Design a protein around this motif. Structure first.
Motif, PDB file in Angstrom:
ATOM      1  N   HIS A  41     -19.338   0.499  14.837  1.00 55.94           N
ATOM      2  CA  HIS A  41     -18.551  -0.002  13.700  1.00 55.94           C
ATOM      3  C   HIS A  41     -19.442  -0.125  12.475  1.00 55.94           C
ATOM      4  N   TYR A  63     -19.972  -1.536   8.792  1.00 53.11           N
ATOM      5  CA  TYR A  63     -19.592  -2.538   7.792  1.00 53.11           C
ATOM      6  C   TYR A  63     -20.349  -2.310   6.492  1.00 53.11           C
ATOM      7  N   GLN A  69     -21.478  -4.348   3.182  1.00 51.60           N
ATOM      8  CA  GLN A  69     -21.700  -5.640   2.538  1.00 51.60           C
ATOM      9  C   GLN A  69     -22.281  -5.438   1.142  1.00 51.60           C
ATOM     10  N   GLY A  89     -21.351 -11.155  -0.813  1.00 53.59           N
ATOM     11  CA  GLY A  89     -20.059 -10.938  -0.158  1.00 53.59           C
ATOM     12  C   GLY A  89     -20.185 -10.969   1.352  1.00 53.59           C
ATOM     13  N   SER A  90     -19.062 -10.727   2.024  1.00 52.08           N
ATOM     14  CA  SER A  90     -19.014 -10.613   3.482  1.00 52.08           C
ATOM     15  C   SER A  90     -18.954  -9.136   3.886  1.00 52.08           C
ATOM     16  N   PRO A  91     -19.338  -8.815   5.140  1.00 46.92           N
ATOM     17  CA  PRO A  91     -19.101  -7.479   5.692  1.00 46.92           C
ATOM     18  C   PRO A  91     -17.622  -7.070   5.683  1.00 46.92           C
ATOM     19  N   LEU A 122     -15.163  -3.970   7.073  1.00 39.82           N
ATOM     20  CA  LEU A 122     -15.067  -2.824   7.992  1.00 39.82           C
ATOM     21  C   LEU A 122     -14.634  -1.529   7.289  1.00 39.82           C
ATOM     22  N   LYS A 181     -14.302   2.431  12.389  1.00 40.24           N
ATOM     23  CA  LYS A 181     -14.293   1.816  13.724  1.00 40.24           C
ATOM     24  C   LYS A 181     -14.359   2.893  14.812  1.00 40.24           C
ATOM     25  N   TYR A 182     -15.116   2.597  15.868  1.00 40.23           N
ATOM     26  CA  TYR A 182     -15.364   3.516  16.995  1.00 40.23           C
ATOM     27  C   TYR A 182     -15.877   4.910  16.579  1.00 40.23           C
ATOM     28  N   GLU A 194     -12.553   6.681  13.339  1.00 41.50           N
ATOM     29  CA  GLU A 194     -11.174   6.334  12.995  1.00 41.50           C
ATOM     30  C   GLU A 194     -11.167   5.486  11.726  1.00 41.50           C
ATOM     31  N   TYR A 229     -24.309  -1.764   7.502  1.00 44.07           N
ATOM     32  CA  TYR A 229     -24.751  -2.106   8.859  1.00 44.07           C
ATOM     33  C   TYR A 229     -23.836  -1.471   9.892  1.00 44.07           C
ATOM     34  N   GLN A 267     -22.663  -1.704  14.023  1.00 45.42           N
ATOM     35  CA  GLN A 267     -22.559  -2.640  15.153  1.00 45.42           C
ATOM     36  C   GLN A 267     -21.975  -1.944  16.379  1.00 45.42           C
ATOM     37  N   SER A 302     -20.099  -2.489  19.995  1.00 51.36           N
ATOM     38  CA  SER A 302     -19.231  -3.434  20.716  1.00 51.36           C
ATOM     39  C   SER A 302     -19.021  -2.985  22.169  1.00 51.36           C
ATOM     40  N   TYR A 351     -23.394  -8.357  21.203  1.00 53.14           N
ATOM     41  CA  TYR A 351     -23.189  -7.275  20.244  1.00 53.14           C
ATOM     42  C   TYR A 351     -24.317  -7.371  19.229  1.00 53.14           C
ATOM     43  N   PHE A 398     -26.324  -5.748  15.724  1.00 56.45           N
ATOM     44  CA  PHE A 398     -26.174  -4.982  14.488  1.00 56.45           C
ATOM     45  C   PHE A 398     -27.404  -4.123  14.239  1.00 56.45           C
TER      46      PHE A 398
END
Ligand SMILES: C[C@@H]1CC[C@@]2(OC1)O[C@H]1[C@@H](O)[C@H]3[C@@H]4CC[C@H]5C[C@@H](O[C@@H]6O[C@H](CO)[C@H](O[C@@H]7O[C@H](CO)[C@@H](O)[C@H](O[C@@H]8OC[C@@H](O)[C@H](O)[C@H]8O)[C@H]7O[C@@H]7O[C@H](CO)[C@H](O)[C@H](O[C@@H]8O[C@H](CO)[C@@H](O)[C@H](O)[C@H]8O)[C@H]7O)[C@H](O)[C@H]6O)[C@H](O)C[C@]5(C)[C@H]4CC[C@]3(C)[C@H]1[C@@H]2C
Ligand SMILES: C[C@@H]1CC[C@@]2(OC1)O[C@H]1[C@@H](O)[C@H]3[C@@H]4CC[C@H]5C[C@@H](O[C@@H]6O[C@H](CO)[C@H](O[C@@H]7O[C@H](CO)[C@@H](O)[C@H](O[C@@H]8OC[C@@H](O)[C@H](O)[C@H]8O)[C@H]7O[C@@H]7O[C@H](CO)[C@H](O)[C@H](O[C@@H]8O[C@H](CO)[C@@H](O)[C@H](O)[C@H]8O)[C@H]7O)[C@H](O)[C@H]6O)[C@H](O)C[C@]5(C)[C@H]4CC[C@]3(C)[C@H]1[C@@H]2C
Ligand SMILES: CC(C)CCC[C@@H](C)[C@H]1CC[C@H]2[C@H]3CC=C4C[C@@H](OC(=O)CCC(=O)O)CC[C@]4(C)[C@H]3CC[C@]12C
Ligand SMILES: CC(C)CCC[C@@H](C)[C@H]1CC[C@H]2[C@H]3CC=C4C[C@@H](OC(=O)CCC(=O)O)CC[C@]4(C)[C@H]3CC[C@]12C
Ligand SMILES: CC(C)CCC[C@@H](C)[C@H]1CC[C@H]2[C@H]3CC=C4C[C@@H](OC(=O)CCC(=O)O)CC[C@]4(C)[C@H]3CC[C@]12C
Ligand SMILES: CC(C)CCC[C@@H](C)[C@H]1CC[C@H]2[C@H]3CC=C4C[C@@H](OC(=O)CCC(=O)O)CC[C@]4(C)[C@H]3CC[C@]12C
Ligand SMILES: CC(C)CCC[C@@H](C)[C@H]1CC[C@H]2[C@H]3CC=C4C[C@@H](OC(=O)CCC(=O)O)CC[C@]4(C)[C@H]3CC[C@]12C
Ligand SMILES: CC(C)CCC[C@@H](C)[C@H]1CC[C@H]2[C@H]3CC=C4C[C@@H](OC(=O)CCC(=O)O)CC[C@]4(C)[C@H]3CC[C@]12C
Lengths: 120, 281, 106, 237, 118
Positions: C34, C36, C38, C42-44, C46, C49-50, C53, C87, C89, C91, C96, C98
């Motif tokens: 995944h 992200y 940032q 701020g925050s991460p 997305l 994903k995978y 996708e 970053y 990550q 899963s 998990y 990073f």
């Protein structure tokens, strides 16, 4: 019965190691080593489930046999070392038996047992 | 997409799911055909789905407990997806039961009595067992879910309840216990370390070995009795006994497969039996 | 702990040109990564994903690729809204973990 | 949220007025009562008492007297009201009654009350306990009553009687726990602060009184299904 | 539209304990897990653990097993984390993060950051 017998042999091997560790007399150790001889020779026939698809002329099988050979070798050394009543050096031989056990045997045995249960 | 959830639909299945769900229904319809002489294609599919739904819904009750310690396909699973899927499955079951009532000629009081009381009677006494005593409470579900699926399937076809369909489904009840017990055997150390209690942990290593053999070799004695005394056709499940010896020597994919063969030959035994050769038909 | 690694530490780019990162795992983690993004203070947020996708709401320039051990995120035409830390990550197994972080620049 | 508040209000109302509600309950039971094959029973009566003793010996582990004394006083009144109703709708029925009696939920609500520290706080604890154990028990008492109740329409006589005792067991068991018991547990602790169950219970309570969601959602569908079975069997058919 | 509102900055002394609240609003609170992530100085995200809001069944990261214990408040929709026995190393942003709505989604909804200072 194979995995069950394997487990029993292994547990009795730990039991023999412990009685040797806590022994004070000669004849007990003199019988213990022959029981180890018997247990090792029984387990020698017990082929690993991980190495069934390959023929017994593979390096790993020779290594497995050599591992058991160096176990029984030290048992034979312990026989000829402890038959005159000296148990401290036999204890030291048993301590080195642990090292070679953990080096090959136990790693392989803890693999064969794991493999056997999975099929059933 | 559909495949990423098709991989989620394996979450409500166990290795003993076929033997507990579909083999009973197939036997029950064979009994109904052998007894009455007319079989219905539609009701067979309805029964087949109605039983699987209730089985799957019950497996998710156990699945939810595997979020406690962190015992839990290749996706991030949350405890909402389990609840949503269990609800959906059980609703599917009840809809299939309603359609079976409408099509069939069975009285509603009896269909409810079996379906809600027997098949769906598990849910009443689980929820309080906790994540430790799941496997221990599962023996009791498998003992009763087997014969009742056979009766449910039989009753829906014929149009009234009987007593013999429970007796005919003992071998299939024992063969499923063999799979569950054999699965519990290999997970002995892990379950013992995690704090979980199963039967195989309670009784020990050797009594497990005796119990496994009992559960494996009883069905063959029951078929050996039924073969010689009742009908020679019903000896067909005894063609698997060389596999049972191999399993007894090597001691659950092999056990699970043996059950499938035993079940198939047992149903083909019931079908091929001569007219009026089996008891109570 | 599946240790993840990343290979420019600081990436210097120009507006319009294509860019690529590389979240190379230590083990085989299937297709579970995944990415992200940032920004400053701020925050991460997305993005992929995978490993392939795309996420509804993200600009179409963000496209992921790769599987097994090596994974790559790539952007085709960077703007003023792409200058951030990225970053990766896994899963797959727990805990998990990073990545390190790949910073952009003009 | 909406139901929890409602059961809170009920719990606090019953906890606040013990003497009036217990008199009313007993008076109602007096106005109800005084107005006007061995092998199967043996095996059932052998298993039932074993189950009861298992549950009592499970309760014994806590290491307190009042929990046993309260759990005992719940059983007597539940057994009494069941005897009233079973006489009114007609010794041999007790084996099935003692299987359906719920002493765990009777013990739980008492343990909530025993973790209090002052005579004012006990009532609020009973209310807080009631809010958690109200819906969970009501749904079980609904399902089990409908599920046992479906057997009273089957046709078999032994089963039609055995199921009737079960229905009247569950209802009479539920009614007592809702009305009589919270007042009783309030009044016993009122008239008697030497009850140490705080540090152990105050962590485990809010985790334990949580069933499985997959079960609790299926019970509502089962409830909704059985209502149609009953409704269709009685009136339309 | 799910948002995870979070508590304000916290100044503390070494050896103390701190409590942070993540008021999750916009969905069925007891349905999903509530994870926690620590962004230390140098920009290195680390996974603390998770908590099931329904039971309270926590599951921590082996590094953060001792000095981070997650609790839940089902009444007011609030997830807590208590940091014990602090040191100079624990000055960091802490995010609360939960998964996407449907199955097969990764972590979309993050908090805002509680700037802890020792
Ligand atoms: C895992 C539990 C669950 C509950 C329960 O037990 C296990 O499962 C149920 C299961 O279904 C049982 C049934 C098994 C089969 C029985 C068969 C019997 O059927 C008779 O009914 C007539 C209907 O027309 C037939 O004619 C007649 O030929 C036939 O004999 C009936 O008299 C009672 C009967 C249905 C039983 C009543 C009691 C139960 C319902 C049992 C009991 C609640
Ligand atoms: C016409 C047919 C139909 C079918 C059938 O026949 C005719 O009729 C049916 C009839 O309807 C029957 C049912 C009648 C009602 C019965 C009720 C009983 O349910 C019990 O199970 C729980 C409710 O689901 C409750 O207790 C637990 O409640 C959980 C939350 O709701 C807690 O999480 C848990 O935890 C606590 O206990 C365990 C931990 O150590 C503790 O720290 C912890 O605080 C508690 O567990 C307790 O509950 C029991 C276990 O479930 C034990 O007694 C007790 O010990 C145990 O601590 C408890 O309140 C309740 O009583 C169950 O046991 C059997 C039961 C369902 C019966 C099974 C068989 C049948 C279906 C019969 C039969 C097939
Ligand atoms: C297993 C559980 C869910 C209990 C079952 C409850 C039944 C008593 C209910 C469920 C739906 C009901 C209805 C199903 C369909 C019929 C025919 C329907 O009218 C038709 O002719 C349409 C038929 C068609 O084309 O499908 C009107 C209602 C009725 C009598 C009902 C009969 C009773 C049923 C089966
Ligand atoms: C066909 C029908 C009538 C059989 C009856 C089924 C149940 C009443 C039985 C099957 C297994 C039983 C028991 C098996 C052993 C345990 C431990 C027992 O007590 C404890 O040790 C508490 C531990 C805990 O539950 O967390 C309570 C749950 C449970 C599953 C029991 C609860 C009642 C159960 C579910
Ligand atoms: C199984 C069925 C028959 C009942 C299941 C629900 C009841 C156990 C509960 C749900 C909310 C309860 C309460 C609903 C409102 C009334 C009026 C009210 O009475 C007062 O105390 C006056 C107003 C006040 O001062 O609060 C509050 C409690 C009471 C008696 C309760 C009666 C019992 C109720 C209906
Ligand atoms: C008697 C006739 C004339 C009127 C029928 C009224 C009641 C029998 C109905 C009205 C609303 C019903 C429900 C009220 C609330 C409870 C708890 C409720 O919430 C839960 O327990 C869900 C699971 C959980 O939260 O743990 C589920 C339905 C239930 C059992 C029902 C019990 C029976 C009730 C009171
Ligand atoms: C929606 C809420 C209020 C819960 C509903 C559950 C029960 C209050 C109801 C549903 C159907 C009822 C009845 C089921 C069948 C009857 C037969 C009836 O007749 C007999 O058994 C013979 C004795 C006689 O002649 O009365 C006695 C009451 C009884 C057992 C009833 C008991 C209570 C039951 C289970
Ligand atoms: C914890 C559990 C195991 C105890 C509670 C379950 C009982 C309510 C069940 C288990 C098996 C049941 C049955 C046992 C055998 C009989 C005789 C049996 O044979 C007949 O009378 C046939 C009648 C017909 O042909 O219609 C019918 C069911 C019946 C009454 C049932 C009575 C109730 C029983 C004992």
């Amino acid at each position: 019965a194979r995995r069950l017998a394997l487990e029993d042999n292994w547990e009795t091997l730990n039991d023999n190691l412990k009685v040797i560790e806590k022994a004070d007399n000669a004849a007990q150790v003199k019988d213990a080593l022959t029981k180890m001889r018997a247990a090792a020779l029984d387990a020698q026939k017990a082929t690993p489930p991980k190495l069934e698809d390959k023929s017994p002329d593979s390096p790993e099988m020779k290594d497995f046999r050599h591992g058991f050979d160096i176990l029984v070798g030290q048992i034979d050394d312990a026989l000829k070392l402890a038959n005159e009543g000296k148990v401290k050096e036999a204890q030291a031989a048993a301590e080195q038996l642990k090292t070679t056990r953990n080096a090959y045997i136990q790693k392989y045995l803890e693999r064969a047992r794991s493999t056997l249960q999975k099929e059933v | 997409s559909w495949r990423q959830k098709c991989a989620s639909y394996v979450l409500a299945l166990r290795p003993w799911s076929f033997s507990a769900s579909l083999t009973p229904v197939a036997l029950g319809s064979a009994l109904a055909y052998r007894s009455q002489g007319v079989l219905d294609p539609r009701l067979l599919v309805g029964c087949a789905v109605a039983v699987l739904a209730v089985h799957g819904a019950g497996n998710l009750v156990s699945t939810y407990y595997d979020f406690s310690k962190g015992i839990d396909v290749d996706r991030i699973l949350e405890p909402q997806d389990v609840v949503r899927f269990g609800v959906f499955l059980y609703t599917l079951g009840c809809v299939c039961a309603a359609c079976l009532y409408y099509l069939s000629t069975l009285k509603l009081e009896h269909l409810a009595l079996i379906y809600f009381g027997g098949l769906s009677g598990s849910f009443l006494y689980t929820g309080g067992i906790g994540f430790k005593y799941v496997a221990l409470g599962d023996l009791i579900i498998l003992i009763t879910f087997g014969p009742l699926a056979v009766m449910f399937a039989y009753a829906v076809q014929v149009g009234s309840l009987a007593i013999f369909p429970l007796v005919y489904a003992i071998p299939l009840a024992l063969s499923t216990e063999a799979i569950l017990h054999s699965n519990n055997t290999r997970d002995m150390e892990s379950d013992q370390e995690a704090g979980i209690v199963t039967l195989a942990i309670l009784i020990g290593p050797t009594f497990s070995y005796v119990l496994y053999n009992t559960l494996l070799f009883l069905p063959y004695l029951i078929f050996s009795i039924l073969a010689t005394h009742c009908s020679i056709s019903l000896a067909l499940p005894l063609l698997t006994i060389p596999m049972a010896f191999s399993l007894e020597r090597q001691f659950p994919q092999r056990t699970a497969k043996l059950n499938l063969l035993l079940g198939l030959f047992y149903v083909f035994g019931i079908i091929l039996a001569p007219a009026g050769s089996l008891p109570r038909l | 702990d599946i240790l993840l690694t990343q290979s420019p530490a600081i990436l210097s780019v120009s507006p319009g040109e294509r860019v690529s990162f590389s979240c190379r795992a230590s083990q085989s983690i299937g297709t579970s990564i995944h990415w992200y993004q940032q920004r400053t203070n701020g925050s991460p947020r997305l993005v992929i994903k995978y490993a392939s996708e795309s996420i509804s709401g993200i600009p179409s320039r963000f496209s992921g690729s790769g599987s097994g051990t090596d994974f790559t995120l790539s952007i085709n035409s960077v703007e003023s809204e792409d200058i951030a830390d990225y970053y990766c990550q896994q899963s797959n197994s727990w805990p998990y973990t990073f990545g390190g972080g790949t910073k952009l620049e003009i | 949220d909406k139901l929890s508040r409602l059961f809170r209000m009920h719990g606090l109302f019953v906890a606040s007025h013990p003497w009036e509600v217990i008199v009313g309950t007993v008076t109602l039971t007096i106005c109800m009562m005084s107005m006007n094959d061995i092998i199967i029973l043996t095996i059932t009566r052998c298993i039932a008492i074993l189950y009861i003793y298992f549950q009592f010996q499970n309760l014994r582990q806590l290491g307190s007297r009042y929990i046993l004394g309260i759990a005992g006083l719940f059983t007597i009144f539940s057994s009494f009201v069941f005897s009233t109703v079973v006489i009114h709708f007609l010794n041999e029925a007790l084996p099935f009654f003692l299987l359906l009696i719920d002493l765990s939920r009777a013990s739980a609500l008492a343990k909530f009350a025993l973790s209090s520290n002052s005579q004012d706080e006990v009532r609020e604890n009973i209310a807080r306990g009631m809010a958690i154990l109200g819906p969970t028990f009501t749904l079980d008492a609904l399902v089990e009553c409908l599920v046992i109740g479906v057997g009273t329409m089957s046709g078999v006589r032994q089963l039609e009687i055995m199921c009737c005792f079960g229905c009247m067991s569950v209802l009479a068991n539920y009614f007592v726990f809702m009305t009589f018991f919270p007042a009783c547990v309030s009044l016993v602790l009122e008239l008697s602060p030497i009850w140490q169950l705080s540090h152990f219970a105050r962590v485990l309570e809010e985790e334990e009184n949580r069933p499985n969601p997959v079960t609790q959602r299926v019970k509502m569908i089962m409830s909704l299904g059985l209502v149609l079975v009953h409704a269709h069997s009685r009136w339309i058919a | 539209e799910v948002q995870l509102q979070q508590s304000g900055p916290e100044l503390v002394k070494p050896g103390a304990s701190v409590k942070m609240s993540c008021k999750a609003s916009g969905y069925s609170f007891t349905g999903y897990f509530m994870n926690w992530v620590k962004q230390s100085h140098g920009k290195s995200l680390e996974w603390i653990g998770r908590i099931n809001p329904y039971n309270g069944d926590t599951f921590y990261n082996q590094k953060f097993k001792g000095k981070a214990t997650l609790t839940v408040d089902k009444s007011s929709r609030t997830a807590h984390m208590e940091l014990r026995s602090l040191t100079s190393a624990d000055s960091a942003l802490y995010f609360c993060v939960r998964r996407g709505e449907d199955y097969g989604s990764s972590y979309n909804y993050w908090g805002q950051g509680t700037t802890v200072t020792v």
